[PDB]
């Protein structure tokens, strides 16, 4: 219900919370992890 | 950072190590506090002297006793540096003085987990049934007033405490309570007083509060569900202050035992901070 | 001989077989503090690799016995095969090399690293029991 | 389960490093930093706190995370000793008659220790270990001491008129006394102005950084004469400007806090002390 | 092949060849760096001339060995123009001079790399924990104003030095330091100093900062956190000129062999640099 | 055992022994400095012995990586056999004690001496390949 532009920005809202939590950094992370570990290659963080 | 995160495995051995009060005996302190009335109502140059000689008895060698004397439960709410390993603190029923003992005991009793407030620069809220505002001084006077999630006043304007809400008027030691989640402006008299943020938990295992006189039910507890009763707060029955010493001191292993110092030394008395 | 012992043991009788060097102990690499602190600045414990037919193991602490009792420190270290050795001939030596250098390690938790810069003295009352 | 030490932690040899470790104290501790009077005098400037907090960003501690201590004098600042943060970076100015408070200012912010009161009017006390020692402090402490034998009688002295006393401290703001172990002594400390309490060492500190600043030191901080402890917690910058100083101090401030940490009784830890 | 490529494969031939003096006697050049004090001390026009053929006695052939006067630290801290192959540079106790003292030994016991710096047009940053700022001259005045990531200032307005943090109030030799990662706009008076970009690499096989008197220090760790101690830097207890010089040269062998080539300058060198 | 060798290969045939603690290594002790200089005060590489049946292999950085990418310095040590061997049982251990006490030791062009002060750390992404 109700909602004054409210779910609107609010499913924007929603998101701007979404982007900054859990879910959020961590895929950002394993992402890089792949460029970071393909770009890498030469000096690619050993891990093992 | 060796503790937990194992499991001691019991196995009922059953081996009884005996005694317990030979190990105190020999390498513990015991420091007793009392107000001036007491020693005054003694008279005697020696009274400290004669104690102590009568402590041997209970096995507490020479120099091992010590006598603080607090002259009022306010001053000693606010100054309660706990000296010795075992403290056990003599307190006389003053019927006008009952929150101010309260809050003492509060303090001496239990255990306090405490960060600074600078009331000047930050919007404050406790958290939980343990977060409480443990304030001591000269003259304490707190005056609060509620935020709504805007920063705007509920019931006063946070610009003129004039429509603050008064719950504090002037006191030695204060423990305040607020409806837990809420935003406070905050306003004391900082000049005289210094208030800070303590989180609650483990009780005592050294101040035996002995309270003197009355009819004694001290509810301690903040909310009206709870009362705790525990073994580090006991009490005597009011004849003549030489007669509260000489039976203290002969059930001083008694009074120990109700404590147990191990959970002691701490480094200091009272607050903590951990800021 | 493996044949040999193959029927003995069908007739449910007592087998036997012989070996140099034998591997009956998993590899096993690891300390124990029985004092420290979070610094790691004064340790007491051991540490062993246990690994085929051989057993090193040393007892350090950082405190000389400064404190102890008679100015002695205790150190015990139990292993446990999963098979019962029988006829053995032991080659029992004092000091344990791999534990005389210098070291680096991980904390137990994994979240620090210690250091560990050994002196070697004799050891005293050793005792070397064969249970079973 | 609380204090029973568990005999050990595992000792296997997992080996993973659980990295950085820096990246939990710059969310979670606080900085603190001791400087005497003359360091910001000559910084003349009413926000050179506010100016190093911002390049303390840098090196990352969060705004609300760094505070600025001044001690006016090594004595003072030796008094009433109220470390308030997590981290405590202490600086010292190089002062060559002032050695001795210094040191004795040292020994008790880089150690861990553990008092009791003392009544110098109703019993004569002794140290037990070259781990017991009296430290005193105050406006003005002046200590006088008289060994007893056996039998409660001085030697060299009479218990009875402190002019025959001897005298081991004149007017100090901090003193560590030590006697010779296991004599019993009559005390006259001037507890007025002194206050004197009988404490036991041991732990030391995992958070103190004492820098020095200047001289040439070498820092002999035990009362014998055959040890010399050399601490990480015990640092050395050479003089210029004081601004220089506290540029180095913020350049450098995790590799100073990398030589601290902890604190034994600053953790869960406590069913302890 | 003589880019600076390497790799070198150590059979333990065992082959321990011998002496290694007897190529710096015969080679080598020996530079001595006294204060004035020193030398009027002696009292000799034929001082320098004495000790050289004492100096054969050690080892070193007449045209050998020579003595460079610095009449102070400040002024000696200059330009480090070191002559000779070997040079043993004597530092005597000045207590208020100390890091006058520390500035001038970090710079000769150490390899410095240079950049020049226009603080007029570019406000600069260093980058590690080996990137100071060594400025040196007549005399050595330099204000900073540490820079927010806008070009603004922080406690200072980039338009009026006096509102800048000094660092330096006219010295002679200056290693500056600021906190890492964070332009600032300088205000040095270059009108008597010179101020340029140093990165700091390897250490210096030469020097050997003799020290008279004191107890002795000097640091050149710009951090709290170590402290360096280099065969480079030794120290005599003083009594008088003539026994320290008597001393230098009693142990010239012993002094060299604590420095040795000047590997920077070695020939065999190319993407390394000299 | 060996006439029955000496048959099977004059036929042209497979043969095959048996070797506790084979002799396949020629004897080799020394080191290589992938990074050095003069003063031999801030160097990097490995030393090893080969000798028999065994190998030890130490890498060494002087710097502990301080500028390294990763922070990480890698390390390799090949070993080429003369002949084959198959079926080998193997003991893999961490550590080469050999190299984990101070020497002093000659220059690769046998000119002067370098000093080693080694501190141990576990080696870290160990990969030990069998290649044919
Ligand atoms: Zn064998």
């Given at each position: 219900?109700?909602?004054?532009?409210?779910?609107?920005?609010?499913?924007?809202?929603?998101?701007?919370?979404?982007?900054?939590?859990?879910?959020?950094?961590?895929?950002?992370?394993?992402?890089?992890?792949?460029?970071?570990?393909?770009?890498?290659?030469?000096?690619?963080?050993?891990?093992? | 950072?060796?503790?937990?995160?194992?499991?001691?495995?019991?196995?009922?051995?059953?081996?009884?190590?005996?005694?317990?009060?030979?190990?105190?005996?020999?390498?513990?302190?015991?420091?007793?506090?009392?107000?001036?009335?007491?020693?005054?109502?003694?008279?005697?140059?020696?009274?400290?002297?004669?104690?102590?000689?009568?402590?041997?008895?209970?096995?507490?060698?020479?120099?091992?006793?010590?006598?603080?004397?607090?002259?009022?439960?306010?001053?000693?709410?606010?100054?309660?540096?706990?000296?010795?390993?075992?403290?056990?603190?003599?307190?006389?029923?003053?019927?006008?003085?009952?929150?101010?003992?309260?809050?003492?005991?509060?303090?001496?009793?239990?255990?306090?987990?405490?960060?600074?407030?600078?009331?000047?620069?930050?919007?404050?809220?406790?958290?939980?049934?343990?977060?409480?505002?443990?304030?001591?001084?000269?003259?304490?006077?707190?005056?609060?007033?509620?935020?709504?999630?805007?920063?705007?006043?509920?019931?006063?304007?946070?610009?003129?405490?004039?429509?603050?809400?008064?719950?504090?008027?002037?006191?030695?030691?204060?423990?305040?309570?607020?409806?837990?989640?809420?935003?406070?402006?905050?306003?004391?008299?900082?000049?005289?007083?210094?208030?800070?943020?303590?989180?609650?938990?483990?009780?005592?295992?050294?101040?035996?509060?002995?309270?003197?006189?009355?009819?004694?039910?001290?509810?301690?507890?903040?909310?009206?569900?709870?009362?705790?009763?525990?073994?580090?707060?006991?009490?005597?029955?009011?004849?003549?202050?030489?007669?509260?010493?000489?039976?203290?001191?002969?059930?001083?292993?008694?009074?120990?035992?109700?404590?147990?110092?191990?959970?002691?030394?701490?480094?200091?008395?009272?607050?903590?901070?951990?800021? | 001989?493996?044949?040999?012992?193959?029927?003995?043991?069908?007739?449910?009788?007592?087998?036997?077989?012989?070996?140099?060097?034998?591997?009956?102990?998993?590899?096993?690499?690891?300390?124990?503090?029985?004092?420290?602190?979070?610094?790691?600045?004064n340790?007491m414990?051991?540490?062993?690799?246990?690994?085929?037919?051989?057993?090193?193991?040393?007892?350090?602490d950082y405190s000389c016995a400064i404190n102890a009792?008679?100015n002695?420190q205790?150190?015990?270290?139990?292993?446990?095969?999963?098979?019962?050795?029988?006829?053995?001939?032991?080659?029992?030596?004092?000091?344990?090399?791999?534990?005389?250098?210098?070291?680096?390690?991980?904390?137990?938790?994994?979240?620090?690293?210690?250091?560990?810069?050994?002196?070697?003295?004799?050891?005293?009352?050793?005792?070397?029991?064969?249970?079973?």
């Amino acid at each position: 219900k109700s909602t004054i532009d409210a779910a609107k920005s609010m499913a924007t809202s929603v998101m701007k919370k979404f982007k900054k939590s859990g879910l959020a950094n961590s895929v950002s992370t394993l992402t890089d992890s792949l460029s970071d570990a393909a770009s890498s290659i030469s000096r690619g963080a050993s891990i093992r | 950072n060796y503790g937990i995160n194992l499991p001691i495995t019991g196995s009922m051995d059953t081996a009884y190590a005996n005694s317990t009060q030979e190990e105190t005996f020999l390498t513990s302190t015991l420091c007793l506090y009392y107000p001036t009335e007491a020693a005054t109502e003694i008279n005697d140059n020696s009274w400290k002297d004669t104690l102590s000689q009568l402590f041997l008895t209970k096995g507490w060698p020479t120099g091992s006793v010590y006598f603080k004397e607090y002259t009022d439960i306010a001053s000693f709410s606010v100054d309660p540096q706990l000296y010795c390993d075992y403290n056990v603190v003599l307190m006389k029923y003053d019927a006008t003085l009952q929150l101010d003992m309260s809050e003492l005991a509060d303090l001496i009793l239990n255990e306090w987990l405490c960060n600074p407030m600078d009331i000047t620069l930050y919007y404050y809220q406790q958290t939980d049934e343990a977060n409480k505002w443990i304030s001591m001084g000269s003259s304490c006077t707190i005056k609060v007033c509620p935020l709504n999630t805007q920063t705007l006043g509920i019931g006063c304007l946070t610009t003129d405490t004039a429509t603050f809400e008064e719950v504090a008027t002037a006191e030695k030691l204060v423990i305040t309570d607020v409806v837990d989640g809420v935003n406070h402006k905050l306003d004391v008299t900082t000049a005289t007083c210094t208030i800070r943020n303590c989180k609650k938990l483990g009780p005592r295992e050294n101040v035996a509060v002995i309270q003197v006189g009355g009819s004694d039910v001290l509810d301690i507890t903040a909310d009206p569900t709870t009362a705790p009763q525990t073994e580090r707060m006991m009490r005597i029955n009011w004849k003549k202050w030489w007669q509260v010493f000489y039976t203290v001191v002969d059930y001083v292993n008694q009074i120990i035992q109700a404590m147990s110092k191990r959970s002691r030394s701490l480094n200091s008395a009272a607050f903590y901070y951990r800021i | 001989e493996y044949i040999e012992n193959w029927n003995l043991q069908n007739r449910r009788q007592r087998t036997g077989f012989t070996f140099h060097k034998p591997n009956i102990f998993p590899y096993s690499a690891s300390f124990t503090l029985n004092r420290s602190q979070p610094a790691h600045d004064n340790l007491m414990g051991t540490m062993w690799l246990n690994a085929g037919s051989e057993i090193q193991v040393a007892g350090f602490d950082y405190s000389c016995a400064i404190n102890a009792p008679a100015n002695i420190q205790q150190f015990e270290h139990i292993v446990q095969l999963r098979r019962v050795l029988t006829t053995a001939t032991i080659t029992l030596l004092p000091d344990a090399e791999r534990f005389s250098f210098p070291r680096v390690i991980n904390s137990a938790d994994g979240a620090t690293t210690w250091y560990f810069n050994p002196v070697i003295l004799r050891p005293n009352n050793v005792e070397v029991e064969f249970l079973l």
